[PDB]
Design a binder for these strands. Structure first.
Lengths: 339, 339, 339
RNA sequence: CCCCCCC
RNA sequence: CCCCCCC
RNA sequence: CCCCCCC
RNA sequence: CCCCCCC
RNA sequence: CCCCCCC
């Protein structure tokens, strides 16, 4: 059945159309040196409103890939959003859907903070501490990638995890910019990813275009590391299933587990059939996701969760254990094997 | 039977949930230098109300371990208390559940006492006599640890013992701070330990995180000494039983003692089975405590109490002697062996 | 034969169905802070009718475990009772099967008593003497656990023992609430346990979920102590048999005792085979109980009862002595060994 | 319906 | 995020 | 039929 | 029910 | 609480 369902979904002669009357903003590569400034003036000043930081990160992505490539990416993502270009005025940027009041506020706040830290201090600002640093857009996109790995999770868990992991992953940027509010920027990125779902596709295309590069700075290598940490998002049950098989859990040989193993292997075969893009299904909110669910094998899922709980892997996972006796037996065996 | 009871209690697939709608306060490490001041402004001034001194000690513990680690500790203790962070205002602290009037009163009393002892005296206040000393939070937590060792006992015995032992254990702090009211601070700590039972788990986690440290001041070494003096709390009968076995008491060979020795050894085997965390069962008020009771062996308990009374160990122990003839015979033999 | 009987009972491919058209009440955790009030307004006032105090204790248990977990517990206990949720009205509770007149009467009686004790007295009601104390539901469940240990016994013995033991076990609660009628509350709990047998399973699940907790108050530790004192209910003959073996009674070597020792050891092997849940068989009224009866070994039972009578353990046990000569000989030898 | 930990 | 020794 | 004390 | 001394 | 000499 599962192969037939995927065959129906894949073999479609008709293309969906959505967001027909909508538009979005991009910034041409000719403005990259400008957007960098903006992407850094968000980082070293303490701003009251961090509402469009995610849009500025996506603007930098658009400068990197190019306006035409970004339009093509949005078009092939199933969304008929018409790209609107970015202009300059007196210079500053007039990004579509980003209020000019916001850009002026961010610029003025950063200029005032820079003046205050230059007047009082000894005037020895290093090359990495200024807003026009060239890795500041990647530093903002690193907060974006941290909150990207938690798009299958909830908002509160995502924000808490982003802050916790960014105090260590982004320690160097925090030292360079003492006053960068990872919570508010992470909230902005979560809002962008939820509202504009095609920007998940744009962000993934940037991740690919960055990982495929021949050279990169440490910021881009960090961004790619986090982006790849997001790969199996929304499918931790499959990873824990292969973990359970590697652990040689005895309760995998139970009668009901052996009964469901056929369709479990069917799900894994479907994973292989989709191939490399299967991992990005839940990150993209591809409607095709959910063909990879193991919820139709309650006993296998309970055994997998029990094995994970025994090994300590389960952590604070919020999934359901359908069959509690199998869960407890598997947990006991996994603890025994671990000890 | 006892092994089966412990097997039932330990092998539970369901987690309890309590204090669901409740919250508690923590203080981030970034405020440690501030909380230290507070924890010392309780010590060198004579305050009318010592109500929240225990909460300030626990706040310092939260600064030491960290807010996130403290939340995790509270969560793994079986209590679903939602941590509330600590803020500053004009600076002073606004601790959740601690009235700002109390903090202002403590600060003002300490400032007035400092002004009085500076105006009249010769102005030679040493570095250890000021409230901002860095061992003052540990000095307060030492009163807390003294009253911690008496949580299995009663309130009046606990307070009397705390004052008696603190006049000698904490003599140096008393010399440094002539006006520190060990009775009221001990009462505050007893109130905290009784009301918020998860703070027993927090206090034990601080004891572990301190004993595991590579270095420490003399205050922290004293705190760990007292904390370890609290280890076997609520189980002095087992310690006196192994004492009686070491004393080779002849009445241990009586018919009824030899009858009960099997299940006595069962209790000791259960002690070994639980392992290192068995000693902290009564300190934590773990409901699992009471599996270690020797009350179901009245003759063994009477012989043990008699041996203790003969050796002079019994002191003023308030336990019951079930069989008075065995108690008296064991006491006579123990006195004879002692002489 | 006994192993074969247990094999038949255990290896059943068919599940029983009972209480098909019946329903029961639970209270969601969101109402715990409310049910606590009710569970305490039963304790400090003198009520004419104590009819549903047991149902209110079970309601608190349902808040603790959760409505869904309680439904699952009732379902796995062999009873197809449909859980009915609890609602609020103007606030007070409308518990299914509990008349709103009863709840209004209890609330009004408690409010009138509180007004009388506040108007006449000096207005210094401590935090533990008020109905909204958080250990009041556990104090009611402690009377419930005392009457739980006497479910194998008769009603009159159970009530007498509950009152006698509660004057000492629950002395602190009695001091806090001078007017709490342990007899009527114990009668209510006995009625609940007899009528709704699935509530024995719910009460045992609460005992497990409480003993497995990492922390607990003194009320919960007391409840777990009593709950574990109930463990071997309905099987005091097996405990006295192992006592007789520990006593090395000479009449155990008699011809008929040695004749029956084989099937006696068979019963003990069956005990080990069932394992931890064997002790709760008579408490649950599991129909499988009675496989553990030693009534088919009249001479062993007579020797065991004689040994118990000699040691003074028999107390006022109402079992039958089949062979009086063995009983008297064993009693004489046990007294001789005791002296 | 699905998802849910850590890095 | 990653990296981190010696030759 | 079974259960039946004390804690 | 459990706990109960001293350090 | 612990420590406390000599070399």
């Amino acid at each position: 059945d599962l192969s037939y369902k995927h065959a129906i979904l894949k073999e479609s002669q008709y293309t969906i159309k959505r967001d027909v009357g909508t538009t979005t903003a991009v910034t041409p590569s000719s403005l990259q040196q400008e957007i960098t400034l903006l992407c850094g003036e968000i980082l070293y000043a303490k701003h009251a409103d961090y509402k469009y930081a995610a849009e500025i990160g996506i603007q930098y992505i658009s400068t990197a890939l190019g306006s035409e490539r970004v339009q093509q990416i949005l078009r092939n993502s199933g969304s008929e959003v018409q790209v609107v270009l970015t202009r300059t005025y007196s210079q500053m940027l007039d990004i579509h859907g980003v209020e000019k009041s916001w850009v002026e506020e961010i610029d003025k706040e950063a200029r005032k903070t820079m003046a205050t830290l230059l007047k009082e201090s000894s005037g020895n600002i290093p090359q990495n501490q200024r807003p026009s640093a060239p890795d500041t857009p990647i530093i903002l996109l690193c907060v974006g990638a941290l909150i990207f790995t938690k798009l299958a999770s909830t908002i509160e868990v995502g924000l808490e995890t982003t802050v916790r992991r960014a105090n260590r992953v982004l320690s160097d940027a925090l030292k360079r910019y003492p006053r960068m509010d990872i919570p508010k920027i992470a909230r902005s990125f979560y809002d962008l990813f939820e509202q504009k779902v095609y920007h998940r596709s744009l962000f993934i295309e940037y991740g690919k275009a960055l990982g495929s590069s021949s050279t990169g700075s440490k910021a881009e290598s960090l961004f790619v590391n986090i982006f790849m940490q997001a790969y199996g998002a929304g499918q931790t049950m499959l990873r824990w299933g292969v973990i359970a098989r590697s652990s040689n859990n005895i309760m995998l040989g139970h009668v009901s587990v052996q009964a469901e193993l056929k369709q479990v292997t069917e799900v894994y075969d479907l994973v292989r059939e989709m191939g490399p893009e299967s991992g990005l299904l839940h990150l993209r909110q591809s409607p095709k996701a959910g063909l990879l669910s193991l919820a139709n094998c309650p006993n296998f899922a309970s055994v997998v969760l029990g094995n994970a709980s025994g090994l300590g892997i389960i952590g604070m996972y919020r999934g359901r254990v359908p069959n509690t006796e199998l869960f407890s037996a598997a947990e006991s065996y996994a603890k025994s094997l671990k000890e």
